[PDB]
Amino acid sequence: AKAKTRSSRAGLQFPVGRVHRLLRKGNYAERVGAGAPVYLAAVLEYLTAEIL
DNA sequence: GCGTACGTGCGTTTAAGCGGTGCTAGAGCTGCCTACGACCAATGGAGCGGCCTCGGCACCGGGATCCCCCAGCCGCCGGCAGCGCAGCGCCTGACGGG
C-alpha cells in the first residue's frame, strides 16, 4: 500500500496531519471528529493568505 | 459678556400595567440503534538538521529638491492732521418805522 498526505487530499498546503495531533494533545476535548481539523487547517490558510 | 435652552412646573392623555383567559409549541426526556473515533502495529519521506554560496540591502557620497522662512514690496485703507468749505446764527446793512 502507498500513502498520500491528507493536505493534498484536501488540496491544501497547511499540515492537517500535524495540526490534528495538536488538538489531540491540547485537551480541548477527549474525542475529535475527523472532519474538524480538515476544516480548521483550511481556515488558517485563508487567514494567512489574507494578510501577506 | 451675551444668550439660549434646558431645568422646572403645569396640564392633558395614553399606553403601560394588572388581572384575567386559552392555547400548543417546543423543550425535556426516554428507547434504541449505528458509526466513527480511538487504538494498535508498520512504514517511509517530509520535515528538520546541517553547510554554504551570491546580491539585496546597507551604506556612502553626491547632487537634487523643497518646503520654510521673511524681508521686499506694494496695495489698500483707515486714521490722522491739515485744508477748503457749507451752513447757520448772529452780525449788521437798507430802508421805512419808532
Swiss-Prot record:
It comes from the Eukaryota. The modification N6-(2-hydroxyisobutyryl)lysine is found at K25. There is a cross-link at K2, K4 (Glycyl lysine isopeptide (Lys-Gly) (interchain with G-Cter in ubiquitin)). It is found in: Nucleus; Chromosome. Following DNA double-strand breaks (DSBs), it is ubiquitinated through 'Lys-63' linkage of ubiquitin moieties, leading to the recruitment of repair proteins to sites of DNA damage. H2AK119Ub and ionizing radiation-induced 'Lys-63'-linked ubiquitination are distinct events. Core component of nucleosome. Nucleosomes wrap and compact DNA into chromatin, limiting DNA accessibility to the cellular machineries which require DNA as a template. Histones thereby play a central role in transcription regulation, DNA repair, DNA replication and chromosomal stability. DNA accessibility is regulated via a complex set of post-translational modifications of histones, also called histone code, and nucleosome remodeling. The nucleosome is a histone octamer containing two molecules each of H2A, H2B, H3 and H4 assembled in one H3-H4 heterotetramer and two H2A-H2B heterodimers. The octamer wraps approximately 147 bp of DNA. Belongs to the histone H2A family. This is Histone H2A type 1. The chain holds residues 13 to 64 of 130 of the full protein.
